[PDB]
Design a protein around this ligand. Structure first.
Ligand SMILES: [Zn+2]
Ligand SMILES: [Zn+2]
Ligand SMILES: [Zn+2]
Lengths: 397, 814, 131, 105, 71
RNA sequence: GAACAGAUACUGACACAGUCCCUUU
RNA sequence: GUGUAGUAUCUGUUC
């Protein structure tokens, strides 16, 4: 009456995808996280047939996966936040062909809990600190200082626990060698339960606050408080310092907002709509994912909507100020939950359901014939979709 | 009136009589504190407390009852805060650790009960007092109250006081308060460094020397509090300190040097190197200072400077060694204790930094001094260096010189200290196999000192043998080991207890290192001499002999007859009375080994006949011995011999067998799944409401068994026990309540939270109160752990017309 | 009333929407194949002899504490997520034997008094028989 | 630990320091006070390890000569996933014993 | 006196806990569990012809005031 | 079953000689 | 042999 468990096929559903030089060389590789299986795969420009390299089962539920590199190194380190109460930092050895544990710190009970961190992972772009936040009331900050032995070390976690608060999305903000800054969609609900008149959900908006990380005094305290007028869902990182101005984007319903700390006023831009949609006119439109091709010449942001339309956001900004946000129509792809653009024109799209395709950029779409859109044009936007012209299908999974 | 008379009779009952009446009075005052009041109580307590005829016991009882009644009066101790503190402060001002710390939490609790305004109105008048003693104790009290209820509510007052110009007394009081806060909080004031930096910055330029000296010492205190980081906040303090360095001379100069030495290790390497280079001149000029306190300060500064990885090793080696070795090796300062404690620590740090070879070569030449204090000091320095760094940088000549110096120092010894023993052991262990040629000489000296002079250092020689047994084993010799063993054999008849314990420990080390079969004196002859030793009444000899007996039983259970086995068993039956926990643990272990060696019939019966002693201390030890016997033997060969014992009507035997079953289940682990059927009738009998002890023991048994069988799917047998475990929750005894809670927690991981959730759901909303409280406590206990695996087991509750209590997302159908 | 009883419990971590007990390869044995919404397909194989069962149980018990998961998740607690595992042996942990370090493989083979080739053959016999 | 209801743990976020145990607390579990199957290591918060508190026993505060571990029962019960087990209370029994020794010598 | 474990946690009940707060805490925990799991959200995505982002948005702005207004 | 006062037992692998972990104008 | 908490069982007087 005793059974034995066996497996025939492996899970193919893709939830996360992070690009980087995990082997330390100049060939980009893709790390894909399944429901409970961690897989590593790389493409080949000569042939285009993607071959799996590593596949190890984690025996757990993975909720986040990010990669980072030290300020000076050439290796990308994988940080995985799972349902457990600990954070693990991974490394890849091409010779051993196996993931090696490096550091391990525990900060609470295991399992998917409301106040246990592990959902949102925030990593500074330069790679000097990592922030892990929970759904409610719990936030943690780590400082990944390196020692003289050409290795990395982890310090004690910091305290940033705000009482009775909800978190929507956390992403790092480039500062340019000063104290790192983190931005999150802060929200309060204490007054919601204190109103027995049924007037809690209405006129209760969310805020956006910046968290500072002072390396001198080693503490985290709230600095800013910028209430919004819409209900955003997730943020977009923007390169700062030398290449472009530091800031974040605010994806919302039929609107995108650029925000910055200092003397930068808020700027809004309507979302373009397809010609004669076959949907409910009152239905809203949101964004699902984005991309960042941080080329040394210039940087452009990709986007995707519910219908599966790729845009191209270009930041037309001055040295200190910003003039307007220019949008563009790029192509149309099946709905995806996570996508990443690669070098040499390679584009990887991980569809939510069905098959996964790998497109190659043949035409850069530099000032296409179709008119563009910008925030400088007063008053909705319409555009006529066209078949796939900029991208050509070469391989499918 | 009556209340005052009540207080008087209560305090006479507390101070005089047996402890039980004191405990009864404490219980009465705790249960009735809600109506005693504060006015008359304190007006009767304080005059007696302040009297100088107060002893330690009466003071402790008074402060304990005061602490017990602090929480009983939340906001009824405010009018007499000044009268409380004027008496409390002299208690803490004494240089006693316990008294000062206890007064510390007393004042902390008093301030927590009070508020900022109350303490302000209480403690303004004494700010500008003139006496230094009351000023110091008031500053300490201010530090405690500022620690209480947070510093930020107190920082603006410190700023206001220190930003005045009336008199220097207020400024000194404020700076002293900041000093005490910094020295007591530690690293808890890191995010509030500026609140004190801007307070203390202005005081470094005043013409008065006292204020700037205290400001410099405060800066040093803040620097040592924020040792890792804080350079950015302290960057604007360097200039006044440097001007004081090149301006002042004396006590203020010492304070400024201490501050700069504490501040150096808080920054990078280049700046630290430059500042050390700048301060080299002052260090050289003050190396020849006459004052011993100045010597301590300069030694601390040198150690702090050398403790940073920013100065080149070669420059330090070529600069600081000659003058430091010329000046800091004397005897006049070595007479005072703290001076050469600090000197030893500084020399150890310097040796760790620059290296061991040069410093050891320079220092070993001083082993020829006649002074015994100098000899022990240099030996302590050498042993500390050897323990810290190692023995990987010593050549042949230094080895020979060190061995000769150690031998000469050992030739003449008079002080009764084990530091020589520790140093010799550490040095020999560090040497390893390089000490082979000098083994015969040192052993001859050891025996020569062993066999003369009333056998006073025989304990020291035995300690030497125990320490050097491992190195002598690694040196590949057996003849000298045999000589040492036989010598200890005839020298085993010493009457002295400490000497007997030491030689027994030496023999234990010998038998540990050398083979039991190859040991030159036969074991069959050692045991007859060893058995009468067990009857001595000294802790050291008993522990040593029991450990040796356990080792020889574990490793030498082949040449021993049953007669002396029974003899030593009977001896241990009464030896189990030993008060030390280690001796009892060793006795239980050796019972385990002897029961493994011999058939578990006679020893098991002997253990079972020792359950009638009417003493609680040894019954649990016998229970643990029985459990370890059953664990080391076959588990199913002891159960028939223990099940039949329960029918004895005496409660002590039943409690003992239940505890033995609990311990056996705990020790077995995952192999106890087969032995659950036999214990079910005993648990069925035990869970009946006969006595609290039986129920508690049964709950412990259930918890241990459930934890052991976790992960094997034995829910079928464990489910039946819950029906009888559950009704044991309605009791007022803390012990049984804790046992039941632990049993439920242990069963939760093994049966699943669904059963306990179903049990708790019925009584969760009972109209009564106590049942609701206990059900809510159980629900909280099950909710804290494994909260994720609860959404599926949650029931469905129908909603009203107003609110919605139905989760339609789980009703989706595909 | 006549309440039923549970004889097996397991947690795959993925939603299962199909169950069927048939034979995959011709001339095989009745196996319990299942599919999940994630996309993975697995089978359940009953044991034949008690010696194989105890050998596999010992191997799994040793590997649970000798080969911890990469993300530091308690494998026993993860499998016993909602209900304790009953009469089920995880095959993934046993199959992870091949990719282990040679030193640990030698140590576990010495502990089990078996050779690594024998362990690999014993592990692959089930896969060859039921696939 | 459990035998004294007047002792309260620090119960704060753990850091990177390692707890230490003295000679008489060698093989005792920190929480449940057991002697079987040490499995994991004990972590203590930063403020409990500073200055004079470096290298001290978690229970009695003696010199540190042995490490602090957790038994298998605590790991299974997941009671190790909590704050540092350092005892901040001074202990009434120790003070009473010290005062009694002082009075009778 | 040993009750500090149950005082430093969110959602812990007490003696005078009524039905509304318990039910709203249960709903919040259920929504958090829905968000955490991947296949439990894929089931919802397949059941109704929307995307993952829309379901996540609905869950995010459904956690504020569930089970109706308070009383 | 609320109390002002006495006596006898049981439970917590509870503890028992610590000399020092010390500290400014 | 001593001390540190808790619990249980038998008594003087009074509701
Ligand atoms: Zn702590
Ligand atoms: Zn200890
Ligand atoms: Zn334990």
């Amino acid at each position: 009456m005793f059974l034995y468990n066996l497996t025939l096929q492996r899970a193919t559903g893709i939830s996360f995808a992070i690009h980087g030089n995990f082997s330390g060389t100049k060939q980009q590789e893709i790390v894909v996280s399944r429901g409970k299986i961690l897989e590593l795969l790389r493409p080949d420009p000569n042939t285009g047939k993607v071959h799996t390299l590593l596949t190890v089962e984690v025996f757990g539920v993975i909720r986040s996966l990010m990669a980072f590199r030290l300020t000076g190194g050439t290796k990308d380190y994988i940080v995985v936040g799972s349902d457990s109460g600990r954070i693990v930092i991974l490394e890849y050895q091409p010779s051993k062909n196996m993931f090696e544990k490096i550091h391990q710190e525990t900060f609470g009970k295991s399992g998917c809990r409301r106040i246990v961190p592990g959902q949102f992972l925030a990593v500074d772009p330069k790679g000097r600190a990592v922030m892990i936040s929970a759904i409610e009331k719990q936030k943690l900050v780590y400082i990944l200082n390196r020692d003289a032995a050409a290795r990395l070390t982890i310090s004690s976690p910091l305290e940033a626990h705000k009482a009775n608060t909800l978190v929507y999305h956390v992403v790092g903000v480039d500062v340019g060698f000063e104290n790192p800054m983190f931005a999150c969609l802060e929200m309060d609900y204490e007054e919601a339960d204190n109103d027995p008149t049924g007037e809690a959900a209405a006129n209760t908006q969310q805020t956006l606050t910046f968290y500072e990380l002072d390396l001198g005094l080693n503490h985290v305290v709230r600095k800013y408080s910028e209430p919004l007028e819409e209900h955003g869902n997730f943020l977009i990182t923007v390169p700062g310092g030398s290449d472009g101005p530091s800031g974040v984007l605010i994806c919302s319903e039929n609107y995108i907002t650029y925000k910055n700390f200092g003397d930068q006023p808020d700027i809004r831009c309507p979302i373009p709509r397809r010609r004669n949609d076959l949907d409910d006119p009152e239905r809203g439109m949101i964004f699902v994912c984005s991309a960042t091709h941080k080329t040394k010449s210039m940087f452009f942001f990709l986007a995707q909507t519910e219908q599966g339309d790729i845009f191209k956001i270009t930041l037309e900004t001055d040295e200190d100020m910003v003039t307007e946000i220019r949008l563009k129509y790029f192509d149309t792809v099946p709905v995806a939950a996570a996508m990443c653009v690669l070098k040499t024109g390679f584009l990887f799209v991980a569809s939510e359901f069905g098959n996964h395709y790998l497109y190659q950029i043949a035409h850069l779409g530099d000032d296409d014939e179709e008119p563009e859109f910008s925030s400088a044009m007063p008053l909705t936007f319409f555009f006529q979709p066209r078949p796939l012209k900029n991208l050509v299908l070469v391989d499918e999974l | 009136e009556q209340k005052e008379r009540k207080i008087m009779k209560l305090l006479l009952k507390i101070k005089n009589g047996t402890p039980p009446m004191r405990k009864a009075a404490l219980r009465q005052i705790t249960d009735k504190a809600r109506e005693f009041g504060a006015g008359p109580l304190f007006n009767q307590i304080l005059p007696l407390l302040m009297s100088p005829t107060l002893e330690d016991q009466e003071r402790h009882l008074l402060v304990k009852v005061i602490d017990r009644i602090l929480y009983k009066l939340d906001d009824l101790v405010r009018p007499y805060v000044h009268k409380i503190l004027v008496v409390i402060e002299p208690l803490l001002i004494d240089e006693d650790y316990y008294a000062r710390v206890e007064g510390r939490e007393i004042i902390s609790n008093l301030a927590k009960a009070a508020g900022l305004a109350t303490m302000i109105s209480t403690m303004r008048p004494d700010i500008d007092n003139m006496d230094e003693y009351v000023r110091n104790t008031t500053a300490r009290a201010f530090a405690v109250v500022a620690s209480a209820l947070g510093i930020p509510s107190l920082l603006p007052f410190l700023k206001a006081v220190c930003k005045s110009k009336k008199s220097w007394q207020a400024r000194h009081t404020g700076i002293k308060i900041v000093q005490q806060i910094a020295i007591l909080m530690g690293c808890a004031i890191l995010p509030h460094l500026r609140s004190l930096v801007e307070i203390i910055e202005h005081g470094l330029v005043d013409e008065q020397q006292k204020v700037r000296t205290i400001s410099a010492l405060a800066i040093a205190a803040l620097a040592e509090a924020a040792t890792p980081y804080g350079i950015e906040s302290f960057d604007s303090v360097l200039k006044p300190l440097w001007k004081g360095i090149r301006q002042h001379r004396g006590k203020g100069l010492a304070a400024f040097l201490k501050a700069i030495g504490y501040l150096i290790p808080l920054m990078d390497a280049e700046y630290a190197n430059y500042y050390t280079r700048e301060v080299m001149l002052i260090l050289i000029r003050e190396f020849q200072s006459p004052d011993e306190e100045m010597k301590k300060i300069v030694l601390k500064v040198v150690k702090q400077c050398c403790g940073t990885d920013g100065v080149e090793a070669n420059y330090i080696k070529t600069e600081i060694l000659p003058p430091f070795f010329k000046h800091f090796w004397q005897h006049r300062m070595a007479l005072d204790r703290r001076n050469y404690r600090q000197l030893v620590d500084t020399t150890v740090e310097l040796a760790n930094k620059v290296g061991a070879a040069e410093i050891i070569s320079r220092i070993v030449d001083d082993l020829k001094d006649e002074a015994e204090q100098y000899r022990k000091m240099v030996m302590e320095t050498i042993e500390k260096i050897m323990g810290n760094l190692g023995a990987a940088d010593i050549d042949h000549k230094l080895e020979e010189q060190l061995i000769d110096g150690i031998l000469y120092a050992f030739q003449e010894q008079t002080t009764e200290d084990s530091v020589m023993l520790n140093g010799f052991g550490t040095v020999v262990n560090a040497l390893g196999k390089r000490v082979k040629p000098y083994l015969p000489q040192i052993c001859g000296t050891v025996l020569w000192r062993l066999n003369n002079k009333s056998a006073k250092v025989r304990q020291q020689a035995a300690d030497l043998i125990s320490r050097t047994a491992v190195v002598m084993k690694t040196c590949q010799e057996e003849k000298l080991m045999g000589h040492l063993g036989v010598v200890l054999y005839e020298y085993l008849g010493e009457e002295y207890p400490e000497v007997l314990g030491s030689i027994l420990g030496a023999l234990k080390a010998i038998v540990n290192v050398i083979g039991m079969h190859k040991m030159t004196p036969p074991i069959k002859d050692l045991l007859p001499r060893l058995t009468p030793i067990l009857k001595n009444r000294h802790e050291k000899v008993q522990e040593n002999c029991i450990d040796l007996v356990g080792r020889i039983a574990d490793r030498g259970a082949e040449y021993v007859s049953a007669r002396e086995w029974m003899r030593i068993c009977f001896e241990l039956l009464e030896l189990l009375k030993a008060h030390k926990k280690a001796i009892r643990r060793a006795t239980v272990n050796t019972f385990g080994y002897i029961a493994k060696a011999i058939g578990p019939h006679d020893v098991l019966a002997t253990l079972l006949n020792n359950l009638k002693v009417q003493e609680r201390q040894n019954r649990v030890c016998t229970t643990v011995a029985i459990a370890i016997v059953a664990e080391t033997c076959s588990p199913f060969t002891v159960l028939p011999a223990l099940m039949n014992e329960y029918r004895v009507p005496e409660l002590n035997v039943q409690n003992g067998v239940l505890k033995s079953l609990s311990f056996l289940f705990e020790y077995i682990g995952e192999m106890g799944k087969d032995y659950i059927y036999a214990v079910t009738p005993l648990l069925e009998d035990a869970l009946m409401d006969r006595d609290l002890v039986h129920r508690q023991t049964a709950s412990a048994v259930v918890q241990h068994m459930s934890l052991g069988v976790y992960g094997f799917g034995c829910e079928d047998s464990l489910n039946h026990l819950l029906n009888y475990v559950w009704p044991n929750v309605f009791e007022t005894s803390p012990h049984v309540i804790q046992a039941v809670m632990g049993a439920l927690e242990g069963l939760r991981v093994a049966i699943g939270p669904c059963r306990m959730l179903q049990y708790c759901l019925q009584g969760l909303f009972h109209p009564a109160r106590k049942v609701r409280d206990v059900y809510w406590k159980i629900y909280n206990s099950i909710y804290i752990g494994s909260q994720d695996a609860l959404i599926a087991h949650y029931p469905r509750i129908y909603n009203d017309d107003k609110n919605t209590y139905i989760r339609y997302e789980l009703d989706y159908i595909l | 009333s006549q309440k039923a009883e549970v004889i097996m419990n397991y947690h795959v971590g993925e939603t299962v929407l199909s169950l069927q007990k048939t034979t995959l390869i011709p001339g095989g044995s009745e196996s319990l194949v299942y599919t999940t919404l994630s996309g993975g397909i697995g089978i359940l194989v009953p044991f034949t002899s008690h010696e194989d069962h105890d050998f596999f149980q010992h191997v799994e018990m040793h590997l649970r504490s000798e080969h911890p998961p990469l993300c530091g998740r308690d494998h026993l607690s993860f499998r016993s997520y909602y209900f304790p595992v009953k009469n089920v042996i995880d095959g993934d942990l046993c199959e992870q034997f091949n990719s282990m370090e040679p030193n640990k493989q030698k140590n576990v083979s010495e502990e089990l008094d078996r050779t690594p080739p024998e362990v690999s053959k014993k592990l692959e016999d089930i896969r060859t028989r039921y696939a | 630990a459990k035998h004294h209801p007047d002792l309260i743990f620090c119960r704060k976020q753990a850091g990177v320091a390692i707890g230490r145990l003295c000679e008489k607390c060698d093989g005792k579990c920190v929480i449940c006070d057991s002697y079987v199957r040490p499995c994991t290591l004990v972590r203590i918060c930063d403020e409990c390890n500073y200055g004079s508190y470096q290298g001290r026993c978690v229970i009695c505060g003696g010199p540190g000569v042995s490490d602090a571990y957790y038994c298998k029962e605590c790991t299974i019960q997941e009671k190790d996933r909590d704050g540092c087990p350092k005892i901040v209370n001074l202990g009434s029994s120790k003070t009473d014993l010290f005062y009694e020794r002082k009075k009778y010598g | 006196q040993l009750e500090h474990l149950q005082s430093k946690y969110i959602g812990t009940g007490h003696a005078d806990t009524t039905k509304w707060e318990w039910l709203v805490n249960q709903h919040r925990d259920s929504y958090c569990s829905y968000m955490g799991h991947f296949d439990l959200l894929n089931y919802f995505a397949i059941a109704e012809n929307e995307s993952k982002a829309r379901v996540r948005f609905n869950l995010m702005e459904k956690m504020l005031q569930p089970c109706g207004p308070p009383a």
